[PDB]
């Protein structure tokens, strides 16, 4: 009886809302896919208008019709048949609009979508393009007269809470009390709730129902090796149905020993991901989400920081289904603005209500680098206490965290507010030397041994066009990014008290204000390029640390022209032995772990082949008289 | 300094050793690839001759040259430059021949290979074709004067033993003492051993050396999710080098609770596999081994019973590398013969010596269905006790087992000999009803609760060309094989005390005496056809039980013409919900587990689409007036 149709086709988009003619578009859509990815700090920001018609949907007697917007960046006004019905501030979360009373036979839908600079809607100051438009789907949902609530913060009127007790960690034996709370409109009598083959019927009172299932020997959601998911289903006499997937897992974060999953140590070692891509902008299809996740899996990252905003349900689903552990946050970022305080609380409420069921999520992020351009005063601290309190009020099952900028003094009162802290560190890239990452954490953990500390950002830019036999910080070479991550990976491996670490970033991403490292409009800290077509050499150092799929990878497949008489051939591998062949003749076999380095005298054009068991790779190395200038940013 | 050359090309095969002209072949080779797969109980058995030349290889002063045979089925006689040098009985194990003193610049190699019927070399009575020939590679190996022994039972002079102590099962924390024992000739004074990035020099005394490595926090070999492997490497003065991969794992078998790995319950649920394939015979390439394992992995089986003989080193390696737990055995099968007793002990020694290092292997099988055609008497008992004692003498780290024919009474003295037992049961196919599987094991386990019991064979024949809406034991339909395996799967799930279960068989396989189920020369109990091209529908019942890779499978993709007005549509899947679409129209969503059954009215030609999440499958069904007679045996 609950029916959904996608309002995907037959839109007309008006860049100038006042123009007589527009352009045909299909959702998802953004108007900044080109001008937000090419540099110049000039992508178009303002109010634009989407228009489309839709026919009156079939409705039960006293049924309702809702428009569902899953992503309208950043501020949306919904006008139906010339009446304005909704105003939404928050470009990353679902909202819905009851349009029943305005329905005629043919309905005019005008959506004004705004991504302008203002002081009321985060984000406003950040290192990523603020793509405007209807970049996620718009839907028309019809419900019976008695229905699960549709207007509360983009939720679905269901709140499922699995509380897990580990009985035998090694056997994965656990019990679970699963609470299903529901909220309903209309004069309902009772509701039926189905969980794990059991069924209960409970009374509705004041639009609210509750059911607890005491499950024994539940099948744990246990990370990448067994991401088992359950389904909770609630159904009303009149026929309305809602459901959430959920997973059963316990976890804790020990300030000294790190993250624990289901009674066992489970160090979180992964990356971050922005929700855009070359060409498409943030108008991502499902296949694009899946491809991003398939690259996560090949990499073997077991956690993703989904900065800096609520991501698509499809991607959180993918994390659920793949056993990936997620850090989720709101775009409370860089510069505090007093007029945005309510927007921070509104986006946090929608984030938690709409994502509370995802077992992949283990923490709520309050803000990112918020003291990069804010004085630490009572106003700032208050905004953070209110967000912290809201997280704890809505969700007893996850801690709060925030990502701190490296200038924030470690004794600031800011750090005492959330349950955990992670620092964004760029020592050895933006500032100082690589060693300062190690010392920063040794000193924090020595001063504050009872605090949980992590590494929420770290990286260095690499343009796969640039190379050097003597990489150094700032040459933007593929080789220095390897040097940087080789050091960070060892530094992290030495420090099991880091609760989670996240490479910034898995992918290059659009930042229209950047014009650095030979590519206009892109942050090049990705381990993979923005079009997902090139995995940079530094991707494979992490694959060597993380992946269990045997591989060998020769670095320098783009460092072909080499002026030096003896060159380093570097192989990344999760095997323990590698054999190098030069022009078909075996030159040397080394044992080791992860990183294998060979000295090769070169005199002409050579075919270099690396072998370990059944795994092989091959590159060309070509001696030249003078360094190739195309490899040089200078 | 140790060098190996493959003698693969430029052979001449003489099916009649007395005939002046023959057939140029390349190894691997068998002369039975065609006539052992087509029925008639008539493939050629006898002695055949392989001839090749090879150049004298480069040898250090006092170095040695060995011909290495990895598989000569079944009896080989090796003659170099007219001198008879070696006689080997056993078609499934490596042996080596010192040819040093007969070398000249251009060397003649003649190998007589015999797969004849006799009372000396097992196997002689079994349900599989006894392919003859050099069906695995022949190599020329040269070593320095001081070298690890080459002539001890096809081993390489290294015996590596990890003793694992589990410190914390949930954390996978464990220590292991790794003992490396070495045998060598040439009177070197010491040897250097490398294990896990450590090295150690120990003395050589009377051709033997021993080094112990006390590893802490080893990376456990932990089954399919993490088959981590180490290397033991030894190096002599003068340059000779041998090595063995090994894994660190502890395991135990509980008669009530089943198999345990690295401190946790790890029920062994899987398949068997014969080392042959359509067209190639048993002359398999490396890629054929890899494809077989790729199919094991898709299926999700975590154990393989490698019946009925020693398999290729490459395939044992694949099991090591993929975390597959293995049952290994010798072809002491069906019919005891007094003059084959020494051959059972020779093959078992070679099996253990050559495969002791494989962490995948967890038990040694003494015999299969040996009482199918043997009286249980003191002589039969003694042969088994001697095999049992040899396993225990050579290997303190693995239990023995045997596969019992279903006629063998459960109080027989035979059952008291091995450490564990498994029965080959075909209730519901060969005899009796499906329920008798359940009660056979109930009654055994109730009577002997302290004994380890398992299921070493079970299955039903299925010809993918045959189909029926009302399958019956004996119609050979793809659909009855699913009915059979649906029952067996549920029976097995109810009985955690079954230490291991093994579907007979992963693949159809050649049995030249069989003329059954519309295919001559093949046993059709495979879950996959013999050419590896068609996975029968019962394959996907197990994949729904075992695989974690999401999938949806429609049965009946070969059951296309159906006479019924409302036909049954069965989907196998490891998902929780399956939606069926007919001609594009969504028609029904069912929740459930493993097996999803739909009822679909059919009037003409329809397209049936099954969906769950991103997983899709599709078949075509055509309503007909009369049953297609091709679907009927
Ligand atoms: C996932 C989730 C969904 C929720 N859905 C509803 C809902 O539909 N209706 C409701 O009244 N409360 C819902 N709640 C709970 C309220 O947010 C909670 O009681 C809160 O403290 C009420 O605050 P408010 O009434 O000011 O919005 C939900 C909570 C969670 C975690
Ligand atoms: C894997 C493995 C390899 C062995 N290799 C040799 C060897 O090369 N030389 C040797 O004298 N014994 C070797 N042994 C010797 C064992 O002591 C021997 O097989 C058994 O105890 C007695 O052997 P025997 O009766 O043939 O002397 C090996 C044992 C194993 C398990
Ligand atoms: Ca621009
Ligand atoms: Ca034949």
Author numbering:
A (entry chain B): 1 to 634
B (entry chain A): 1 to 633
What sentences appear in the manuscript?
Because intestinal β-glucuronidase (GUS) enzymes have been shown to convert a wide range of glucuronidated metabolites to their corresponding aglycones, we hypothesize that gut microbial GUS orthologs would catalyze the conversion of TSC-G to TCS. The human and mouse gut microbiome have been shown to contain hundreds of unique gut microbial GUS enzymes, which exhibit distinct substrate specificities toward varying glucuronides. Previous studies have shown that microbial GUS enzymes can be categorized into seven distinct clades based on active site architecture and/or cofactor binding. Our central finding is that specific gut microbial enzymes, notably, gut microbial GUS proteins of the Loop 1 and FMN-binding clades, mediate the colonic reactivation of TCS from its inactive glucuronide metabolite, and in doing so they drive the gut toxicity of TCS.
In addition to Loop 1 GUS enzymes, our in vitro results with purified enzymes showed that FMN-binding GUS proteins, notably R. hominis 3 (Rh3) GUS, also efficiently process TCS-G. Thus, we determined the crystal structure of Rh3 GUS and refined it to 2.4 Å resolution. The structure reveals a protein dimer with solvent-accessible active sites located ~30 Å from the bound FMN molecules. Using analogous docking and mutagenesis methods to those outlined above, we validated that specific structural motif, including residues F406 and Y430, as well as the C-terminal domain (see the scheme of the C-terminal domain in Supplementary Fig. S10), are critical for processing TCS-G. Again, these mutant proteins exhibited no structural changes when compared to the wild-type protein. F406 is unique to Rh3 GUS compared to another FMN-binding GUS protein, R. hominis 2 (Rh2) GUS, that we show poorly processes TCS-G (see the alignment of Rh3 GUS and Rh2 GUS in Supplementary Fig. S11). Rh3 GUS and Rh2 GUS also vary in their C-terminal regions, as their C-terminal sequences share only 27% sequence identity, likely contributing to their differences in activity. We were surprised to find that GUSi also inhibited, albeit with less potent IC50 values of 3.7–13 µM, the processing of TCS-G by FMN-binding GUS enzymes. To date, no structure of an FMN-binding GUS C-terminal domain has been reported, as they have remained mobile and unresolved in the structures determined thus far.
